[PDB]
């Protein structure tokens, strides 16, 4: 039943009318009892009729307190990216450093010779990202897929603890430049992430679907073997950049898609993605989390080797949604094994 649905799993692309757009959890579900989760990445549509800010012109002043300028070393489509962090700068100077000519898009036909000029000069002229940002752009009123209250079960750990995870369970902002990237990963304790590009150039993705995504880890460990033997997850430190002729070359399935402003992107638990922005921009995102995810939480690889890594306890989870199973898992006894195919169980209506 969900094998047959997506079965390439592509990227899939949703355009939600403004009545299915009002609910998050419940369109959500849908475009999983479409198939959507089997790429690992969605693209959402909104409607025409939706803004979640009426201008960005009032912007210029806001603070970037940790600038992050990108340095890339590696060759033949394998790089490992060290991050240098500056001093912090206001958007309006930030917008200028990346509009000079020093830093600005090169020129270019096609979306293909961009991208080729992305993994050709990766290594040079490293940019800025305006990186982690704590903030919203959302008008305190927009009640439609709000990143700052989405109000899904990842609500449970602030609620149960008070701990708040900032861009986990809060939102970040991110000012792009052309060339700036995010490294080969997945969310933190496997979530679901949102984000949204509110304005500016492009941000194009690469996508690996779940139930690949192990065989892109093995390869991974395979070209880094120093970084596998000092961490269980290595992939989580987010420094590693691999380009999309050597997934090809080594048999990974992938899918590309490309993010313009006003667009929502959706990754799905264990879904690896990585990508650049074309150019000046602003994306904003957080985590969030469906019954689905909670699986995925409690078998989730974490990174060994770093005390300030993200770890989220799952027992409120695992009691409240998963009772028969507490005392089994509690005891290590619980062997449930997950099918990446099958969508989260508030699809059923569906
Ligand atoms: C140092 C340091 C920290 C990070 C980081 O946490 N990055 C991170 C953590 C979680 C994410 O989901 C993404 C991310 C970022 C984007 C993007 O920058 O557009 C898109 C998709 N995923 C990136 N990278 O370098
Ligand atoms: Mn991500
Ligand atoms: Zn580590």
Redesign the pocket.
Known sequence: ESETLNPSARIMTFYPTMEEFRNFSRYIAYIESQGAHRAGLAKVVPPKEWKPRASYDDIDDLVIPAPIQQLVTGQSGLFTQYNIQKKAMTVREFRKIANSDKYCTPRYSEFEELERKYWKNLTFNPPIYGADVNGTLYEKHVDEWNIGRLRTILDLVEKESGITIEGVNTPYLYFGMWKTSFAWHTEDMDLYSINYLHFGEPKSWYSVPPEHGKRLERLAKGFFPGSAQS?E??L??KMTLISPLMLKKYGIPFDKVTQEAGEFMITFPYGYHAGFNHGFNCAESTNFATRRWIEYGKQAVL????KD?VKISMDVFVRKFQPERYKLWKAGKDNTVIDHTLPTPEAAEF
């Open positions: 961490c997850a290595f989580r430190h990174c060994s080797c770093r890594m």
